[PDB]
Amino acid sequence: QVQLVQSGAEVKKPGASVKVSCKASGYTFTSYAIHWVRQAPGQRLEWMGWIKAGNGNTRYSQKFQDRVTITRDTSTTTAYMELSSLRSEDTAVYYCALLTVLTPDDAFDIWGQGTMVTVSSASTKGPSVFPLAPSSKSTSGGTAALGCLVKDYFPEPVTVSWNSGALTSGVHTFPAVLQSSGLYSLSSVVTVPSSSLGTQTYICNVNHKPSNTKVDKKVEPK
Amino acid sequence: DIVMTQSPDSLAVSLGERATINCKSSQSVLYSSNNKNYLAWYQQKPGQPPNLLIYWASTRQSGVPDRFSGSGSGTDFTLTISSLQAEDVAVYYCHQYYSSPLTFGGGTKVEIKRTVAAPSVFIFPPSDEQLKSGTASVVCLLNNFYPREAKVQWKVDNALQSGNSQESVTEQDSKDSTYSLSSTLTLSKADYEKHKVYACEVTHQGLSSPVTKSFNRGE
């Protein structure tokens, strides 16, 4: 029950500002300092700053002093990070974390799930979702493959779940590819018993927050 | 800034074998007053946030398996996984909290070497729905293979295709240590309707000859 829940992925134009939230829960909020760390794609973790959730004092990295502001709302047990004058280079995953609460008895370290922020001039586009239906050409040796093709969206990320999260085993959601059009595309697939295609129901749940798009697609045989 | 440098950037070792990761810091992170190294090790499994493994250079976080251990002092530190398990697929980062700003190493990606496994191959014709939109995507799925190297060629009516397909490979699976791969051939509807036979041909170390899955458009 101790956890940090961050706000959802966002897209912004260069020069704009973004504000990410970190809802804390399960411990006494004012006791510990909340840090903000960013992870640029294919790169290391970059510390941005921390705020003491009690007295609200802050410390920022010199790399980000100019244009980061870290605040906290004691009544809602929430911490916020605002990055302004955004540039395309600021495209990254932003994490809030209780980094290394080190005491004699315990060590306590908790991270939020991350918030992907894309800074781009390109237009936002929600995906088209198509079934990858099981048939004789995707069934072999008692196993059937099926999936959903999530085509032509921008920016990342799309999240894919199956059966509202009840189906996770055997699921492969592939890394997106960049199409020549500048839009992304991916597939999510799952292998299941071919014998149970007649009795089981498979629904891919696709969510693209930047375009506020949500699609549930039932994937049926043939 | 205390710069953190990890070595190697990547390593592959077999299941059950020892994996060692190195980290060097610009300055010493050993505090003379309490003789403690202000250094931690984090694990980041695919798609998940970092997870604390070691702190004070050599103290295991509660719940971390005993096979993870940390050693070193001053500027030189090591993370050792004594017997690598499938679930240890991750990027590992060293971290210093001796001075501001806090800094992290560049990360080391750990791959598991398991037994050779040939891919299962599946193919999906375009959906009737996508054909209405005017495009045809043909998806070839290569499931649960190891090692990662695999070659996929497309043939339309036995003619080798070039320049109309894209591939994507998964991260290594945390349970069976395999990869999967998708190759998608994209045509216009009008181009799709010019040909009958669509085929995906797969080459992999675990196969003695190529495996082909194919379908006739309209069946």
């Binding site: 921390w50 | 501001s100 806090l102």
Partner: peptide
């Protein structure tokens, strides 16, 4: 010379 305010969560 440790900086105690690098991470106030470290005792």
């Amino acid at each position: 010379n440790v900086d105690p305010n690098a991470n106030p969560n470290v005792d």
